[PDB]
Write a protein that binds this ligand. Structure first.
Ligand SMILES: [Cl-]
Length: 569
């Protein structure tokens, strides 16, 4: 199965996921939720053989919630209720009413199912009174769960006739009633003339159970005959007999998705689950990591210490293999506070040993994995969530330093599409503004790292000035850097510069020298009237001259290629 194979299957996935979503919400708010009711709602509008079969299975589960656990009593209750409802629909069709007594809905039923049209009884040897078959009536009252009424009918006709003595304690139809009430002749479980449907058969057996006829015996018979002999009522049969594992199996044969969700239903009723959910996750795990988390969180539906470990393990393998860190593990907001990911939202349901250490451990681990894989952006994101502030600055300083030295001066550092997640300049600005102005966080950062970062930000500002041809403002910003000789002293210090700064100096010199060439040209124009024209030129030529000697002393510590474009300027 693959939930993304087509749009017909994809929609069903979304509808079911929303249900599971609301279920986790109830579990967590410790509130009221009726999952069976939910699917019943979604399936009642569906159409087909299997869908009609699934809709009824959910009704079976629904009619079973919050009830004393008793497979046989619950199967009887269900089948009896269902027959009653069935006789209702028949009355509301034949007599078009809806307000007749139970007893009358049933005589109306008995009357239209035991006559050949001929006003001739279809089954010979019926004991009759006032034109109505007392044992047939008595049987279908039982069959409807209406023991009070069945007893009344027996009492009334007492005389036209002490099985009645035993009945109070507890023709073919007369044979059935004695057999069911007496629970006699168990060797002959079947009395077919009065069995007109599969529902009737299952109910007959359930009646008979625990001279000795056990549920396990009933189940054996069912399994023995297999799906072959239950037409389109095998799932119901499986659930009614309490063969829950086999019900799921069977549902897998025509619909993996419905099987998963039926299993969620039985589980929520407390009756390979982790594996059922982990497997169903496989196809939408990468395209919908939030839905994956929702289904895996169901694993703790059972509170055993064993399957809580299965849940954490599955969640670990989700984050490691999908690397949807932001969604799963969260992200840091501009106030410095973590904005929870999906796993942190469902943490109550996770039954963790330590609220804070569970996510921290996964995060720290994924972090060491990211910097070993060379995933720089992942690393930065993860070390933020780890609150490893200093490592974050170090990694940003490298990333930003590398972007500056490797980009061309002619090309803008930052486009209109760029964001703090993908652009090193934008990213670094975001980190500075979240961490440097936050005293609690800044103290955790090494003053030198913070220095380098500010420098790299200043340099990125200088770069945008330079690109927009703001020569003079570039120069005065360049001068505040305290890096270039506005000489010999600083070339000697060149060896003590941070490794991140030194790869930026060659471009700094090319910007500096090129702003000077441009200003000088502007100052030489005729239109340029200033009384200090000449002292400005000279002063610019001084800076250029000192950068040149500086440049020459450090010439083999930048590519010849750049030292050459710098000399020829
Ligand atoms: Cl640069």
């Amino acid at each position: 199965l693959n939930v993304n194979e087509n749009n017909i299957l994809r929609e069903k996935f979304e509808n079911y996921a929303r249900i599971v979503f609301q279920f986790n919400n109830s579990r967590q708010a410790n509130g009221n939720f009726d999952i069976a009711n939910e699917f019943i709602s979604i399936l009642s509008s569906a159409n087909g053989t299997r869908n009609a079969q699934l809709l009824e299975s959910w009704k079976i589960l629904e009619s079973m919630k919050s009830k004393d656990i008793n497979i046989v009593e619950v199967g009887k209750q269900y089948l009896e209720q269902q027959f009653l409802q069935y006789t209702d629909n028949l009355y509301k069709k034949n007599m078009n009413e809806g307000l007749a007594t139970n007893v009358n809905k049933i005589k109306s039923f008995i009357d239209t199912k035991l006559k050949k049209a001929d006003k001739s009884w279809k089954i010979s040897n019926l004991t009759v009174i006032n034109g109505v078959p007392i044992w047939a009536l008595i049987f279908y009252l039982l069959r409807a769960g209406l023991i009070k009424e069945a007893l009344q009918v027996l009492v009334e006709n007492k005389a036209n006739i002490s099985f009645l003595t035993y009945f109070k304690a507890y023709d073919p139809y007369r044979l059935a009633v004695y057999k069911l009430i007496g629970r006699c002749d168990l060797s002959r479980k079947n009395i077919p003339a009065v069995t007109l449907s599969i529902e009737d058969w299952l109910w007959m057996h359930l009646m008979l159970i625990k001279e000795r006829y056990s549920l396990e015996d009933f189940q054996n018979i069912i399994i023995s005959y297999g799906p072959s002999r239950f037409s389109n009522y095998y799932l119901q049969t499986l659930l009614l007999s309490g063969l829950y594992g086999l019900a799921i199996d069977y549902t897998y044969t025509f619909s993996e998705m419905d099987a998963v969700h039926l299993a969620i239903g039985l589980a929520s009723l407390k009756l390979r689950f982790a594996n059922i959910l982990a497997n169903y996750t496989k196809s939408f795990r990468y395209s919908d990591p939030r839905v994956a988390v929702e289904y895996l969180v169901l694993i703790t539906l059972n509170e055993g210490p064993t399957d809580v470990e299965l849940c954490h393990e599955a969640l670990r393998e989700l984050v490691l293999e999908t690397k949807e860190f932001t969604v799963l593990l969260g992200k840091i907001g501009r106030d410095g506070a973590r904005i929870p990911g999906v796993i942190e939202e469902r943490q109550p349901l996770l039954h963790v040993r330590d609220e804070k250490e569970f996510l921290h451990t996964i995060t720290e681990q994924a972090a060491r994995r990211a910097d070993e894989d060379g995933r720089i952006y992942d690393s930065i994101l993860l070390y933020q969530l780890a609150e490893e502030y200093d490592i974050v600055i170090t990694l940003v300083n490298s990333l930003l330093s590398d972007t500056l030295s490797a980009s061309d001066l002619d090309q803008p550092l930052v486009g209109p599409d760029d964001n703090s997640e993908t652009n090193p300049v934008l990213l670094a600005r975001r980190m500075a503004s979240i961490y440097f102005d936050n005293a609690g966080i800044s103290r955790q950062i090494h003053v030198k790292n913070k220095e380098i970062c500010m420098l790299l930000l200043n340099i990125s500002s200088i770069r945008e000035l330079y690109f927009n041809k703001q020569w003079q403002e570039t120069l005065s910003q360049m001068e505040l850097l305290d890096l270039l000789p506005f000489a010999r002293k600083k070339a000697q210090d060149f060896s003590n510069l941070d490794d991140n700064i030194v790869k930026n100096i060659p471009n700094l010199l090319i910007i500096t020298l090129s702003c000077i060439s441009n200003m000088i040209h502007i100052l030489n124009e005729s239109k340029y009237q200033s009384s200090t024209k000449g002292q400005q030129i000279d002063s610019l030529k001084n800076v250029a001259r000192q950068c040149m000697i500086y440049a020459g002393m450090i010439q083999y510590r930048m590519p010849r290629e750049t030292y050459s474009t710098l000399i020829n300027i």
